[PDB]
Amino acid sequence: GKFGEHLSKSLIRQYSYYYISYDDLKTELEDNLSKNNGQWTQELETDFLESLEIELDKVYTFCKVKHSEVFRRVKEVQEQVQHTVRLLDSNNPPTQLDFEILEEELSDIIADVHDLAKFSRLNYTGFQKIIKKHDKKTGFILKPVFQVRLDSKPFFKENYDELVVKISQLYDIARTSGRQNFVRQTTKYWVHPDNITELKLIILKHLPVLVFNTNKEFEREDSAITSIYFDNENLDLYYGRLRKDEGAEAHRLRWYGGMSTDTIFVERKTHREDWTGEKSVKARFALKERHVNDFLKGKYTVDQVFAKMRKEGKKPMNEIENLEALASEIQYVMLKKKLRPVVRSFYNRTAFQLPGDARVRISLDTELTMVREDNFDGVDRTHKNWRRTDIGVDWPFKQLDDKDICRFPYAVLNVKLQTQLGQEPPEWVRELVGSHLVEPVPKFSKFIHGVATLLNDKVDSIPFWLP
Protein backbone atom coordinates (compact mmCIF):
# COMPACT_ATOMS: atom_id res chain seq x y z
CA GLY A 1 0.00 0.00 0.00
CA LYS A 2 1.05 3.62 -0.92
CA PHE A 3 -0.57 5.14 2.32
CA GLY A 4 0.80 2.14 4.34
CA GLU A 5 4.44 2.72 3.09
CA HIS A 6 4.14 6.63 3.44
CA LEU A 7 3.21 6.36 7.22
CA SER A 8 5.90 3.53 7.54
CA LYS A 9 8.76 5.96 6.46
CA SER A 10 7.93 8.21 9.59
CA LEU A 11 9.73 5.46 11.79
CA ILE A 12 12.69 5.81 14.29
CA ARG A 13 15.57 6.11 11.62
CA GLN A 14 18.13 4.98 14.36
CA TYR A 15 16.62 1.36 14.19
CA SER A 16 15.43 1.44 10.39
CA TYR A 17 16.95 -2.10 9.68
CA TYR A 18 15.03 -4.00 12.47
CA TYR A 19 11.60 -2.61 11.14
CA ILE A 20 9.38 -4.76 8.75
CA SER A 21 10.74 -4.80 5.10
CA TYR A 22 7.25 -3.60 3.75
CA ASP A 23 8.75 -2.31 0.39
CA ASP A 24 10.82 -5.60 -0.10
CA LEU A 25 7.72 -7.83 0.72
CA LYS A 26 5.47 -5.54 -1.57
CA THR A 27 7.95 -5.96 -4.55
CA GLU A 28 8.26 -9.80 -3.83
CA LEU A 29 4.43 -10.14 -4.40
CA GLU A 30 4.28 -7.87 -7.60
CA ASP A 31 7.51 -9.39 -9.24
CA ASN A 32 6.27 -13.02 -8.63
CA LEU A 33 2.75 -11.94 -9.98
CA SER A 34 4.54 -10.39 -13.12
CA LYS A 35 5.88 -13.98 -13.82
CA ASN A 36 3.46 -17.13 -14.06
CA ASN A 37 0.93 -14.57 -15.80
CA GLY A 38 -0.95 -13.09 -12.71
CA GLN A 39 -1.34 -16.56 -11.04
CA TRP A 40 -0.12 -17.37 -7.47
CA THR A 41 0.74 -21.04 -6.54
CA GLN A 42 1.39 -23.16 -3.27
CA GLU A 43 5.22 -23.12 -4.04
CA LEU A 44 5.02 -19.23 -4.38
CA GLU A 45 3.06 -19.12 -1.00
CA THR A 46 5.87 -21.09 0.94
CA ASP A 47 8.56 -18.59 -0.40
CA PHE A 48 6.45 -15.54 0.80
CA LEU A 49 5.63 -17.20 4.25
CA GLU A 50 9.44 -18.02 4.66
CA SER A 51 10.26 -14.27 4.03
CA LEU A 52 7.58 -13.26 6.70
CA GLU A 53 9.20 -15.74 9.21
CA ILE A 54 12.71 -14.06 8.70
CA GLU A 55 10.97 -10.60 9.26
CA LEU A 56 9.03 -11.86 12.41
CA ASP A 57 12.25 -13.39 13.96
CA LYS A 58 14.11 -10.04 13.26
CA VAL A 59 11.29 -7.87 14.94
CA TYR A 60 10.75 -10.40 17.94
CA THR A 61 14.57 -10.66 18.79
CA PHE A 62 15.02 -6.80 18.65
CA CYS A 63 11.93 -6.32 20.98
CA LYS A 64 13.43 -9.07 23.32
CA VAL A 65 16.97 -7.36 23.29
CA LYS A 66 15.57 -3.76 23.94
CA HIS A 67 13.24 -5.27 26.73
CA SER A 68 16.41 -6.50 28.61
CA GLU A 69 18.10 -3.02 28.08
CA VAL A 70 15.20 -0.88 29.65
CA PHE A 71 14.76 -3.46 32.56
CA ARG A 72 18.59 -3.21 33.26
CA ARG A 73 18.52 0.72 33.06
CA VAL A 74 15.61 0.82 35.67
CA LYS A 75 17.40 -1.83 37.98
CA GLU A 76 20.61 0.40 37.88
CA VAL A 77 18.78 3.80 38.61
CA GLN A 78 16.70 1.98 41.41
CA GLU A 79 20.10 1.21 43.13
CA GLN A 80 21.24 4.88 42.37
CA VAL A 81 18.05 6.48 43.98
CA GLN A 82 18.36 4.03 47.04
CA HIS A 83 21.99 5.36 47.54
CA THR A 84 20.93 9.15 47.26
CA VAL A 85 17.87 8.58 49.68
CA ARG A 86 20.33 6.89 52.21
CA LEU A 87 22.64 10.03 51.74
CA LEU A 88 19.76 12.53 52.74
CA ASP A 89 20.28 11.66 56.53
CA SER A 90 24.14 12.25 56.45
CA ASN A 91 25.96 15.67 57.23
CA ASN A 92 26.31 16.28 53.42
CA PRO A 93 22.76 15.62 51.82
CA PRO A 94 22.51 15.40 47.89
CA THR A 95 22.21 18.83 46.10
CA GLN A 96 19.24 19.95 43.78
CA LEU A 97 21.59 19.16 40.73
CA ASP A 98 22.01 15.43 41.95
CA PHE A 99 18.15 14.95 41.69
CA GLU A 100 18.11 16.85 38.26
CA ILE A 101 20.65 14.21 36.84
CA LEU A 102 18.35 11.29 38.15
CA GLU A 103 15.28 13.14 36.58
CA GLU A 104 17.24 13.51 33.18
CA GLU A 105 18.18 9.74 33.29
CA LEU A 106 14.54 8.66 34.23
CA SER A 107 13.11 10.91 31.37
CA ASP A 108 15.70 9.26 28.97
CA ILE A 109 14.37 5.74 30.05
CA ILE A 110 10.68 7.08 29.61
CA ALA A 111 11.70 8.01 25.95
CA ASP A 112 13.31 4.46 25.47
CA VAL A 113 10.04 2.69 26.68
CA HIS A 114 8.01 5.20 24.44
CA ASP A 115 10.23 4.39 21.30
CA LEU A 116 9.85 0.61 22.04
CA ALA A 117 5.97 1.04 22.24
CA LYS A 118 6.04 3.06 18.89
CA PHE A 119 8.27 0.28 17.25
CA SER A 120 5.81 -2.55 18.22
CA ARG A 121 2.54 -0.70 17.15
CA LEU A 122 4.05 0.34 13.70
CA ASN A 123 5.45 -3.23 12.97
CA TYR A 124 2.04 -4.84 14.04
CA THR A 125 0.19 -2.40 11.63
CA GLY A 126 2.92 -3.15 8.97
CA PHE A 127 2.26 -6.95 9.22
CA GLN A 128 -1.59 -6.45 9.10
CA LYS A 129 -1.25 -4.05 6.03
CA ILE A 130 1.14 -6.38 3.99
CA ILE A 131 -1.32 -9.38 4.63
CA LYS A 132 -4.31 -7.02 3.60
CA LYS A 133 -2.34 -6.34 0.29
CA HIS A 134 -1.52 -10.15 0.00
CA ASP A 135 -5.29 -11.13 0.26
CA LYS A 136 -6.12 -8.32 -2.34
CA LYS A 137 -3.28 -8.89 -4.99
CA THR A 138 -3.36 -12.77 -4.45
CA GLY A 139 -6.40 -15.18 -4.15
CA PHE A 140 -4.87 -16.94 -1.02
CA ILE A 141 -6.23 -15.61 2.38
CA LEU A 142 -3.79 -15.06 5.36
CA LYS A 143 -5.95 -12.53 7.48
CA PRO A 144 -7.12 -15.22 10.19
CA VAL A 145 -3.55 -16.75 10.23
CA PHE A 146 -1.56 -13.58 11.27
CA GLN A 147 -4.33 -11.77 13.34
CA VAL A 148 -4.48 -14.84 15.75
CA ARG A 149 -0.59 -15.43 15.76
CA LEU A 150 0.11 -11.68 16.62
CA ASP A 151 -2.79 -10.96 19.18
CA SER A 152 -1.40 -13.87 21.32
CA LYS A 153 2.44 -13.42 22.01
CA PRO A 154 2.73 -9.61 20.89
CA PHE A 155 5.93 -7.56 20.06
CA PHE A 156 5.38 -5.31 23.17
CA LYS A 157 5.28 -7.52 26.35
CA GLU A 158 2.69 -7.27 29.22
CA ASN A 159 5.72 -6.82 31.70
CA TYR A 160 5.88 -2.99 30.86
CA ASP A 161 2.76 -2.12 33.09
CA GLU A 162 4.83 -3.35 36.19
CA LEU A 163 7.85 -1.24 34.86
CA VAL A 164 5.57 1.97 34.37
CA VAL A 165 4.54 1.81 38.16
CA LYS A 166 8.28 1.42 39.22
CA ILE A 167 9.47 4.26 36.80
CA SER A 168 6.71 6.57 38.35
CA GLN A 169 7.81 5.59 41.96
CA LEU A 170 11.50 6.60 41.25
CA TYR A 171 10.37 9.79 39.27
CA ASP A 172 8.12 10.89 42.27
CA ILE A 173 11.24 10.58 44.62
CA ALA A 174 13.20 13.02 42.26
CA ARG A 175 10.03 15.33 42.10
CA THR A 176 9.21 15.44 45.92
CA SER A 177 12.94 15.70 47.11
CA GLY A 178 13.58 18.56 44.60
CA ARG A 179 12.78 22.21 45.82
CA GLN A 180 18.40 31.45 48.99
CA ASN A 181 19.86 33.19 52.20
CA PHE A 182 19.35 31.20 55.51
CA VAL A 183 21.22 30.33 58.81
CA ARG A 184 22.45 26.63 59.28
CA GLN A 185 22.54 25.15 62.88
CA THR A 186 23.81 21.53 63.52
CA THR A 187 23.48 20.23 67.18
CA LYS A 188 24.15 16.74 68.73
CA TYR A 189 22.30 15.24 71.81
CA TRP A 190 22.71 12.18 74.18
CA VAL A 191 19.45 10.16 74.60
CA HIS A 192 18.93 7.53 77.39
CA PRO A 193 17.85 3.95 76.03
CA ASP A 194 14.52 4.32 78.05
CA ASN A 195 13.71 7.59 76.05
CA ILE A 196 14.54 6.10 72.45
CA THR A 197 10.91 4.81 71.60
CA GLU A 198 9.29 7.87 73.42
CA LEU A 199 11.45 10.31 71.27
CA LYS A 200 10.73 8.33 67.95
CA LEU A 201 6.88 8.65 68.54
CA ILE A 202 7.14 12.49 69.14
CA ILE A 203 9.24 13.29 65.93
CA LEU A 204 7.17 10.86 63.56
CA LYS A 205 4.02 13.09 64.27
CA HIS A 206 5.86 16.09 62.51
CA LEU A 207 8.67 14.56 60.26
CA PRO A 208 8.05 11.06 58.59
CA VAL A 209 10.57 8.11 58.90
CA LEU A 210 12.71 8.09 55.69
CA VAL A 211 12.44 4.63 53.89
CA PHE A 212 14.88 3.84 50.96
CA ASN A 213 13.59 0.67 49.02
CA THR A 214 9.79 0.73 50.18
CA ASN A 215 8.92 -2.14 47.59
CA LYS A 216 10.60 -4.73 50.08
CA GLU A 217 9.92 -6.11 53.66
CA PHE A 218 11.63 -4.28 56.67
CA GLU A 219 15.10 -5.85 57.43
CA ARG A 220 17.50 -5.32 60.48
CA GLU A 221 20.55 -4.57 58.13
CA ASP A 222 18.56 -1.74 56.24
CA SER A 223 18.86 0.91 59.10
CA ALA A 224 22.61 0.01 59.77
CA ILE A 225 25.48 2.50 58.91
CA THR A 226 29.22 1.51 59.27
CA SER A 227 32.11 4.06 58.87
CA ILE A 228 35.88 3.14 58.90
CA TYR A 229 37.87 6.19 60.17
CA PHE A 230 41.49 6.59 58.92
CA ASP A 231 44.57 8.00 60.79
CA ASN A 232 48.41 7.41 61.28
CA GLU A 233 50.52 5.90 64.24
CA ASN A 234 51.08 9.50 65.67
CA LEU A 235 47.15 10.00 65.36
CA ASP A 236 47.75 13.46 63.59
CA LEU A 237 44.15 13.64 62.10
CA TYR A 238 42.57 12.95 65.60
CA TYR A 239 44.46 15.88 67.32
CA GLY A 240 43.61 18.17 64.35
CA ARG A 241 39.82 17.46 64.65
CA LEU A 242 39.96 17.66 68.54
CA ARG A 243 41.96 21.03 68.57
CA LYS A 244 39.76 22.27 65.52
CA ASP A 245 42.85 23.48 63.45
CA GLU A 246 42.57 25.33 60.03
CA GLY A 247 42.08 22.74 57.21
CA ALA A 248 41.85 19.76 59.72
CA GLU A 249 40.72 16.70 57.70
CA ALA A 250 38.67 13.63 58.79
CA HIS A 251 38.86 10.57 56.42
CA ARG A 252 36.26 7.75 56.45
CA LEU A 253 34.97 4.87 54.23
CA ARG A 254 31.20 4.44 54.73
CA TRP A 255 28.66 1.74 53.52
CA TYR A 256 24.84 1.49 53.98
CA GLY A 257 23.39 -1.94 54.84
CA GLY A 258 24.88 -5.45 55.28
CA MET A 259 28.23 -6.98 54.08
CA SER A 260 26.68 -7.62 50.55
CA THR A 261 26.88 -3.70 49.99
CA ASP A 262 28.55 -2.98 46.59
CA THR A 263 29.05 0.87 46.88
CA ILE A 264 31.72 2.25 49.36
CA PHE A 265 31.61 6.06 49.95
CA VAL A 266 35.08 7.71 50.32
CA GLU A 267 34.00 10.60 52.68
CA ARG A 268 36.15 13.64 53.78
CA LYS A 269 35.30 16.35 56.42
CA THR A 270 37.47 19.57 56.37
CA HIS A 271 37.30 22.17 59.24
CA ARG A 272 37.46 25.82 57.99
CA GLU A 273 37.68 28.95 60.24
CA ASP A 274 36.51 32.50 59.19
CA TRP A 275 34.90 35.81 60.59
CA THR A 276 31.29 34.39 60.03
CA GLY A 277 32.04 31.42 62.43
CA GLU A 278 32.88 27.65 62.21
CA LYS A 279 32.29 25.92 58.80
CA SER A 280 32.72 22.18 58.03
CA VAL A 281 33.31 21.59 54.24
CA LYS A 282 32.08 17.99 53.51
CA ALA A 283 32.91 16.23 50.17
CA ARG A 284 32.76 12.55 48.87
CA PHE A 285 32.71 10.04 45.87
CA ALA A 286 31.49 6.41 45.17
CA LEU A 287 33.94 3.41 44.81
CA LYS A 288 33.51 -0.46 44.40
CA GLU A 289 34.76 -2.69 47.40
CA ARG A 290 37.13 -4.69 45.00
CA HIS A 291 38.94 -1.35 43.98
CA VAL A 292 39.16 0.24 47.58
CA ASN A 293 42.39 -1.73 48.72
CA ASP A 294 44.37 -0.78 45.51
CA PHE A 295 43.08 2.91 45.59
CA LEU A 296 44.41 3.57 49.22
CA LYS A 297 47.73 1.81 48.20
CA GLY A 298 47.91 4.00 44.99
CA LYS A 299 47.82 0.93 42.56
CA TYR A 300 44.27 1.96 41.37
CA THR A 301 44.74 5.47 39.71
CA VAL A 302 42.11 8.38 39.63
CA ASP A 303 41.67 7.85 35.76
CA GLN A 304 40.89 4.08 36.51
CA VAL A 305 38.19 5.17 39.17
CA PHE A 306 36.22 7.42 36.69
CA ALA A 307 37.02 5.11 33.60
CA LYS A 308 33.34 3.80 33.36
CA MET A 309 31.98 7.29 34.55
CA ARG A 310 33.73 9.25 31.64
CA LYS A 311 32.54 6.89 28.76
CA GLU A 312 28.83 7.35 30.00
CA GLY A 313 29.01 11.19 29.43
CA LYS A 314 25.85 12.38 31.32
CA LYS A 315 27.53 14.46 34.18
CA PRO A 316 28.74 18.21 33.74
CA MET A 317 32.45 18.62 32.51
CA ASN A 318 33.21 20.88 35.58
CA GLU A 319 31.62 18.33 38.09
CA ILE A 320 33.67 15.26 36.69
CA GLU A 321 37.10 17.10 37.18
CA ASN A 322 35.83 18.35 40.71
CA LEU A 323 35.37 14.63 41.79
CA GLU A 324 38.77 13.77 40.05
CA ALA A 325 40.63 16.59 42.02
CA LEU A 326 38.88 15.36 45.28
CA ALA A 327 39.94 11.65 44.61
CA SER A 328 43.64 12.72 43.96
CA GLU A 329 43.58 14.91 47.19
CA ILE A 330 42.39 11.96 49.46
CA GLN A 331 44.84 9.42 47.72
CA TYR A 332 47.76 11.96 48.33
CA VAL A 333 46.86 12.56 52.13
CA MET A 334 46.48 8.65 52.47
CA LEU A 335 50.15 8.08 51.24
CA LYS A 336 51.94 11.38 52.43
CA LYS A 337 50.56 11.16 56.07
CA LYS A 338 50.78 7.21 55.84
CA LEU A 339 47.10 6.69 57.02
CA ARG A 340 45.58 3.24 57.93
CA PRO A 341 42.14 1.94 59.47
CA VAL A 342 42.01 3.10 63.17
CA VAL A 343 38.35 3.13 64.50
CA ARG A 344 35.02 1.63 63.17
CA SER A 345 31.71 3.40 64.01
CA PHE A 346 28.57 1.15 63.83
CA TYR A 347 24.96 2.40 64.48
CA ASN A 348 21.34 1.90 63.29
CA ARG A 349 20.02 5.29 62.03
CA THR A 350 16.32 6.29 61.96
CA ALA A 351 15.96 9.40 59.67
CA PHE A 352 13.07 11.89 60.15
CA GLN A 353 12.46 14.50 57.32
CA LEU A 354 9.77 15.89 54.96
CA PRO A 355 10.59 15.51 51.13
CA GLY A 356 11.91 18.79 49.60
CA ASP A 357 12.11 20.45 53.07
CA ALA A 358 15.53 21.15 54.72
CA ARG A 359 14.11 23.60 57.50
CA VAL A 360 14.17 20.77 60.20
CA ARG A 361 16.11 17.44 59.57
CA ILE A 362 16.47 15.04 62.60
CA SER A 363 18.19 11.53 62.83
CA LEU A 364 18.49 9.06 65.80
CA ASP A 365 21.64 6.83 66.04
CA THR A 366 20.86 3.66 68.10
CA GLU A 367 23.11 0.59 69.05
CA LEU A 368 26.23 2.93 68.73
CA THR A 369 29.56 0.99 68.93
CA MET A 370 33.31 1.84 68.55
CA VAL A 371 35.49 -1.04 67.13
CA ARG A 372 39.39 -1.14 66.99
CA GLU A 373 40.74 -1.35 63.36
CA ASP A 374 44.45 -0.43 64.16
CA ASN A 375 47.67 -2.63 64.60
CA PHE A 376 49.47 -0.27 67.22
CA ASP A 377 49.24 -2.94 70.05
CA GLY A 378 50.95 -5.52 67.67
CA VAL A 379 47.61 -7.23 66.68
CA ASP A 380 46.74 -7.43 62.91
CA ARG A 381 42.86 -6.99 63.00
CA THR A 382 42.30 -5.89 59.32
CA HIS A 383 44.87 -8.59 58.02
CA LYS A 384 45.94 -5.88 55.43
CA ASN A 385 42.45 -4.96 54.13
CA TRP A 386 40.46 -1.61 54.46
CA ARG A 387 38.10 -3.21 57.19
CA ARG A 388 37.74 -6.11 59.77
CA THR A 389 36.29 -9.35 58.25
CA ASP A 390 35.57 -11.09 61.72
CA ILE A 391 32.75 -8.51 62.35
CA GLY A 392 30.03 -7.19 60.01
CA VAL A 393 26.58 -5.77 60.99
CA ASP A 394 25.97 -8.66 63.65
CA TRP A 395 25.54 -6.26 66.78
CA PRO A 396 26.53 -6.33 69.80
CA PHE A 397 29.53 -8.33 68.16
CA LYS A 398 30.07 -10.60 71.34
CA GLN A 399 33.03 -12.46 69.56
CA LEU A 400 35.26 -9.25 69.90
CA ASP A 401 37.48 -8.70 73.01
CA ASP A 402 36.44 -6.05 75.71
CA LYS A 403 39.53 -3.80 74.88
CA ASP A 404 38.62 -3.79 71.06
CA ILE A 405 34.85 -2.88 71.44
CA CYS A 406 33.21 0.22 73.10
CA ARG A 407 29.39 -0.16 73.50
CA PHE A 408 28.11 3.50 73.88
CA PRO A 409 25.49 3.71 76.81
CA TYR A 410 23.41 6.46 74.98
CA ALA A 411 21.72 7.21 71.55
CA VAL A 412 22.99 10.16 69.41
CA LEU A 413 20.27 12.57 68.14
CA ASN A 414 21.47 14.80 65.25
CA VAL A 415 19.17 17.91 64.85
CA LYS A 416 20.02 19.94 61.64
CA LEU A 417 18.22 23.35 61.38
CA GLN A 418 18.05 25.52 58.21
CA THR A 419 15.75 28.49 59.24
CA GLN A 420 15.34 31.63 56.96
CA LEU A 421 16.86 35.06 58.08
CA GLY A 422 14.43 36.91 60.42
CA GLN A 423 12.32 33.77 61.29
CA GLU A 424 11.86 31.36 64.31
CA PRO A 425 11.87 27.41 63.81
CA PRO A 426 8.62 25.33 64.71
CA GLU A 427 7.56 25.31 68.46
CA TRP A 428 7.73 21.38 68.68
CA VAL A 429 11.56 21.20 67.82
CA ARG A 430 12.24 24.33 70.10
CA GLU A 431 10.45 22.44 73.02
CA LEU A 432 12.22 19.05 72.17
CA VAL A 433 15.88 20.45 72.14
CA GLY A 434 15.33 21.96 75.69
CA SER A 435 13.42 18.91 77.14
CA HIS A 436 14.50 16.23 79.81
CA LEU A 437 14.60 13.49 77.01
CA VAL A 438 17.82 14.95 75.43
CA GLU A 439 21.25 15.96 76.95
CA PRO A 440 23.03 18.69 74.74
CA VAL A 441 26.67 17.70 73.95
CA PRO A 442 28.39 20.54 71.85
CA LYS A 443 30.54 19.36 68.84
CA PHE A 444 30.32 15.55 69.78
CA SER A 445 32.21 13.14 67.46
CA LYS A 446 31.93 9.31 67.03
CA PHE A 447 35.58 9.33 65.65
CA ILE A 448 37.04 11.50 68.53
CA HIS A 449 35.11 9.38 71.22
CA GLY A 450 36.29 6.01 69.69
CA VAL A 451 40.05 6.97 69.40
CA ALA A 452 40.14 8.59 72.96
CA THR A 453 38.35 5.51 74.63
CA LEU A 454 39.90 2.47 72.74
CA LEU A 455 43.43 4.08 72.35
CA ASN A 456 43.50 6.11 75.74
CA ASP A 457 47.16 4.90 76.37
CA LYS A 458 48.39 6.38 72.97
CA VAL A 459 46.45 9.77 73.32
CA ASP A 460 47.60 12.67 75.69
CA SER A 461 44.71 15.16 74.93
CA ILE A 462 41.02 13.98 75.44
CA PRO A 463 37.51 15.73 74.89
CA PHE A 464 35.37 17.29 77.73
CA TRP A 465 32.63 14.50 77.51
CA LEU A 466 35.10 11.71 78.81
CA PRO A 467 34.38 9.59 80.96
PDB file of N, CA, C and O in Angstrom, residues 204-231:
ATOM      1  N   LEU A 204       7.947  11.426  64.711  1.00  0.00           N
ATOM      2  CA  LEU A 204       7.173  10.855  63.555  1.00  0.00           C
ATOM      3  C   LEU A 204       5.789  11.578  63.324  1.00  0.00           C
ATOM      4  O   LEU A 204       5.209  11.446  62.235  1.00  0.00           O
ATOM      5  N   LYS A 205       5.284  12.337  64.358  1.00  0.00           N
ATOM      6  CA  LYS A 205       4.021  13.095  64.272  1.00  0.00           C
ATOM      7  C   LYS A 205       4.207  14.432  63.477  1.00  0.00           C
ATOM      8  O   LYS A 205       3.208  15.059  63.085  1.00  0.00           O
ATOM      9  N   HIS A 206       5.505  14.853  63.239  1.00  0.00           N
ATOM     10  CA  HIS A 206       5.857  16.093  62.509  1.00  0.00           C
ATOM     11  C   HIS A 206       6.680  15.786  61.234  1.00  0.00           C
ATOM     12  O   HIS A 206       6.336  16.278  60.149  1.00  0.00           O
ATOM     13  N   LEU A 207       7.784  14.967  61.377  1.00  0.00           N
ATOM     14  CA  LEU A 207       8.666  14.558  60.260  1.00  0.00           C
ATOM     15  C   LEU A 207       8.546  13.019  60.045  1.00  0.00           C
ATOM     16  O   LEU A 207       8.761  12.260  61.001  1.00  0.00           O
ATOM     17  N   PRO A 208       8.191  12.528  58.792  1.00  0.00           N
ATOM     18  CA  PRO A 208       8.051  11.064  58.591  1.00  0.00           C
ATOM     19  C   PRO A 208       9.386  10.315  58.542  1.00  0.00           C
ATOM     20  O   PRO A 208      10.412  10.902  58.159  1.00  0.00           O
ATOM     21  N   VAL A 209       9.369   8.986  58.924  1.00  0.00           N
ATOM     22  CA  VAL A 209      10.568   8.113  58.896  1.00  0.00           C
ATOM     23  C   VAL A 209      10.953   7.862  57.422  1.00  0.00           C
ATOM     24  O   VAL A 209      10.125   7.363  56.638  1.00  0.00           O
ATOM     25  N   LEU A 210      12.201   8.238  57.049  1.00  0.00           N
ATOM     26  CA  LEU A 210      12.714   8.085  55.688  1.00  0.00           C
ATOM     27  C   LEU A 210      13.015   6.601  55.368  1.00  0.00           C
ATOM     28  O   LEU A 210      13.859   5.974  56.035  1.00  0.00           O
ATOM     29  N   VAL A 211      12.292   6.040  54.351  1.00  0.00           N
ATOM     30  CA  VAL A 211      12.443   4.634  53.892  1.00  0.00           C
ATOM     31  C   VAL A 211      13.045   4.654  52.459  1.00  0.00           C
ATOM     32  O   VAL A 211      12.517   5.355  51.575  1.00  0.00           O
ATOM     33  N   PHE A 212      14.163   3.893  52.246  1.00  0.00           N
ATOM     34  CA  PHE A 212      14.883   3.839  50.960  1.00  0.00           C
ATOM     35  C   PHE A 212      14.167   2.992  49.855  1.00  0.00           C
ATOM     36  O   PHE A 212      13.643   3.573  48.889  1.00  0.00           O
ATOM     37  N   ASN A 213      14.167   1.614  50.001  1.00  0.00           N
ATOM     38  CA  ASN A 213      13.588   0.667  49.018  1.00  0.00           C
ATOM     39  C   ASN A 213      12.061   0.746  48.879  1.00  0.00           C
ATOM     40  O   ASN A 213      11.561   0.810  47.747  1.00  0.00           O
ATOM     41  N   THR A 214      11.306   0.713  50.056  1.00  0.00           N
ATOM     42  CA  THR A 214       9.792   0.734  50.179  1.00  0.00           C
ATOM     43  C   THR A 214       9.146  -0.575  49.593  1.00  0.00           C
ATOM     44  O   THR A 214       8.424  -1.265  50.325  1.00  0.00           O
ATOM     45  N   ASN A 215       9.440  -0.921  48.274  1.00  0.00           N
ATOM     46  CA  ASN A 215       8.917  -2.139  47.587  1.00  0.00           C
ATOM     47  C   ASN A 215       9.706  -3.462  48.052  1.00  0.00           C
ATOM     48  O   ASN A 215      10.104  -4.303  47.216  1.00  0.00           O
ATOM     49  N   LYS A 216       9.908  -3.600  49.409  1.00  0.00           N
ATOM     50  CA  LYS A 216      10.603  -4.729  50.079  1.00  0.00           C
ATOM     51  C   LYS A 216      10.282  -4.723  51.582  1.00  0.00           C
ATOM     52  O   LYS A 216      10.109  -3.636  52.174  1.00  0.00           O
ATOM     53  N   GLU A 217      10.210  -5.942  52.208  1.00  0.00           N
ATOM     54  CA  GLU A 217       9.923  -6.105  53.661  1.00  0.00           C
ATOM     55  C   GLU A 217      11.063  -5.523  54.544  1.00  0.00           C
ATOM     56  O   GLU A 217      12.247  -5.606  54.162  1.00  0.00           O
ATOM     57  N   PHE A 218      10.686  -4.906  55.723  1.00  0.00           N
ATOM     58  CA  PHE A 218      11.632  -4.276  56.675  1.00  0.00           C
ATOM     59  C   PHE A 218      12.660  -5.283  57.246  1.00  0.00           C
ATOM     60  O   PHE A 218      12.279  -6.278  57.892  1.00  0.00           O
ATOM     61  N   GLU A 219      13.970  -5.017  56.982  1.00  0.00           N
ATOM     62  CA  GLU A 219      15.101  -5.849  57.428  1.00  0.00           C
ATOM     63  C   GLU A 219      15.950  -5.095  58.489  1.00  0.00           C
ATOM     64  O   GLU A 219      15.989  -3.846  58.485  1.00  0.00           O
ATOM     65  N   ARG A 220      16.636  -5.868  59.401  1.00  0.00           N
ATOM     66  CA  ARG A 220      17.504  -5.322  60.481  1.00  0.00           C
ATOM     67  C   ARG A 220      18.731  -4.570  59.901  1.00  0.00           C
ATOM     68  O   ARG A 220      19.105  -3.505  60.421  1.00  0.00           O
ATOM     69  N   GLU A 221      19.352  -5.139  58.809  1.00  0.00           N
ATOM     70  CA  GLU A 221      20.546  -4.574  58.128  1.00  0.00           C
ATOM     71  C   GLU A 221      20.275  -3.229  57.410  1.00  0.00           C
ATOM     72  O   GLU A 221      21.207  -2.447  57.244  1.00  0.00           O
ATOM     73  N   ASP A 222      18.984  -2.976  56.973  1.00  0.00           N
ATOM     74  CA  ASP A 222      18.555  -1.744  56.241  1.00  0.00           C
ATOM     75  C   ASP A 222      18.924  -0.415  56.952  1.00  0.00           C
ATOM     76  O   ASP A 222      19.493   0.483  56.314  1.00  0.00           O
ATOM     77  N   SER A 223      18.597  -0.301  58.275  1.00  0.00           N
ATOM     78  CA  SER A 223      18.856   0.909  59.097  1.00  0.00           C
ATOM     79  C   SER A 223      20.355   1.104  59.487  1.00  0.00           C
ATOM     80  O   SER A 223      20.751   2.223  59.868  1.00  0.00           O
ATOM     81  N   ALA A 224      21.178   0.009  59.396  1.00  0.00           N
ATOM     82  CA  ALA A 224      22.608   0.012  59.768  1.00  0.00           C
ATOM     83  C   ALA A 224      23.500   0.891  58.887  1.00  0.00           C
ATOM     84  O   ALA A 224      23.336   0.922  57.657  1.00  0.00           O
ATOM     85  N   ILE A 225      24.467   1.618  59.546  1.00  0.00           N
ATOM     86  CA  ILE A 225      25.482   2.497  58.910  1.00  0.00           C
ATOM     87  C   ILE A 225      26.847   2.201  59.581  1.00  0.00           C
ATOM     88  O   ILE A 225      26.967   2.309  60.821  1.00  0.00           O
ATOM     89  N   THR A 226      27.869   1.827  58.764  1.00  0.00           N
ATOM     90  CA  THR A 226      29.216   1.514  59.267  1.00  0.00           C
ATOM     91  C   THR A 226      30.260   2.389  58.568  1.00  0.00           C
ATOM     92  O   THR A 226      30.335   2.393  57.328  1.00  0.00           O
ATOM     93  N   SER A 227      31.062   3.156  59.375  1.00  0.00           N
ATOM     94  CA  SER A 227      32.112   4.055  58.869  1.00  0.00           C
ATOM     95  C   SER A 227      33.481   3.664  59.423  1.00  0.00           C
ATOM     96  O   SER A 227      33.633   3.499  60.647  1.00  0.00           O
ATOM     97  N   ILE A 228      34.491   3.504  58.514  1.00  0.00           N
ATOM     98  CA  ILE A 228      35.877   3.143  58.895  1.00  0.00           C
ATOM     99  C   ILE A 228      36.749   4.413  58.859  1.00  0.00           C
ATOM    100  O   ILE A 228      37.129   4.870  57.772  1.00  0.00           O
ATOM    101  N   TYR A 229      37.054   4.984  60.051  1.00  0.00           N
ATOM    102  CA  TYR A 229      37.873   6.195  60.169  1.00  0.00           C
ATOM    103  C   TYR A 229      39.353   5.897  60.030  1.00  0.00           C
ATOM    104  O   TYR A 229      39.863   4.937  60.639  1.00  0.00           O
ATOM    105  N   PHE A 230      40.057   6.729  59.216  1.00  0.00           N
ATOM    106  CA  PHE A 230      41.491   6.588  58.921  1.00  0.00           C
ATOM    107  C   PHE A 230      42.342   7.612  59.618  1.00  0.00           C
ATOM    108  O   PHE A 230      41.941   8.785  59.738  1.00  0.00           O
ATOM    109  N   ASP A 231      43.556   7.167  60.092  1.00  0.00           N
ATOM    110  CA  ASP A 231      44.572   7.997  60.792  1.00  0.00           C
ATOM    111  C   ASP A 231      45.944   7.244  60.856  1.00  0.00           C
ATOM    112  O   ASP A 231      45.993   6.026  60.618  1.00  0.00           O
TER     113      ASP A 231
END
